[PDB]
Structure 1
Amino acid sequence: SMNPPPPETSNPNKPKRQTNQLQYLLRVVLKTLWKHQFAWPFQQPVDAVKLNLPDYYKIIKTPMDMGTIKKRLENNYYWNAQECIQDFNTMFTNCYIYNKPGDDIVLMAEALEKLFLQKINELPTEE
């Protein structure tokens, strides 16, 4: 039913960088999705208590959301772009696993994922 602790966004032991690709992921990819009309369900961890979803964290064992991704990018938590791309893909996949085709939340995830794919297609080569 209690929410779990959120995903990690701070860990001094983890080595960090700021690459041109990670800068693009913040300034282009995250900013584009965050401002969209369908962003709001994805701007923070799923609150299973307030939403009355007592089975959510039985089914979803690798939670992810754009609030967590925003904190990771603004904190320079990542070593490379692939780590961050994986977090976006985990967020979309969790939504499709929990819900059903044609549900409103699935239509919202599909619209955001289309934009994600259009932006990642022009990820710059690493300098």
Structure 2
Amino acid sequence: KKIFKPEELRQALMPTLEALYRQDPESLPFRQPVDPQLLGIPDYFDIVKSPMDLSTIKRKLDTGQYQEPWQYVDDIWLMFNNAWLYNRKTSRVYKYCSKLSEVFEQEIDPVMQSLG
């Protein structure tokens, strides 16, 4: 039941988020919230009830919204799962999502062993 200072959480986790955000071009579809009206996908919020993206996660990390590291990890998988759920497996975004998830696994694994 260890408690982490918000600042130490940000320090430990931010490099993993940076690694995802910097991944080009695979991060591009995940750098901002999905905007259904712009994209012409009006059923999006019927399928995805809990939208998530890298900018939102970044904000949560900056503003003390995570009490413990698994909450960050939860949001990352929420983001990936939303994309795997909504998009066809052949789609560009699905494929980018999978590649990003592999980057995430490599970066996160040592951090979370070293943390919680």
- Scaled by the length of structure 2, the TM-score of the pair is 0.87
Q: Count how many residue pairs are aligned between Structure 1 and Structure 2.
A: 111
> Which structure is richer in relative contact order (CA contacts within 8 A, separation 6 or more)?
1
Q: When you count helix as a share of all residues, which structure comes out higher? A: 2
Percent identical pairs in the alignment equals: 31
Unmatched 5+ stretches in structure 2? none
Q: Distance in 2 between matches of 1:113 and 1:82?
A: 16
- Map residues 86-97 of structure 1 onto 2, 5 A cutoff: 86-97=74-85
Deviation at 1:19, TM superposition (A): 5.8
Regions of 4+ moved over 3 Å: 19-22
Structure 1 position 34 matched with structure 2 position 21:
yes
Structure 1 position 59 matched with structure 2 position 47:
yes
Deviation at 1:20, TM superposition (A): 3.6
Unmatched 5+ stretches in structure 1? 1-15
Label 1:19 to 1:82 Cα distance change in 2 as closer, same or farther (>3 A).
farther
- Map residues 1-127 of structure 1 onto 2, 5 A cutoff: 17-18=5-6, 20-26=8-14, 28-37=15-24, 38-123=26-111, 125-126=114-115
Provide the alpha-carbon RMSD of the alignment: 1.8
Measured against aligned partners, the alpha-carbon deviations of 1:6-29 in whole angstroms (never above 9, x if no partner) come to: xxxxxxxxxx94264542211x21
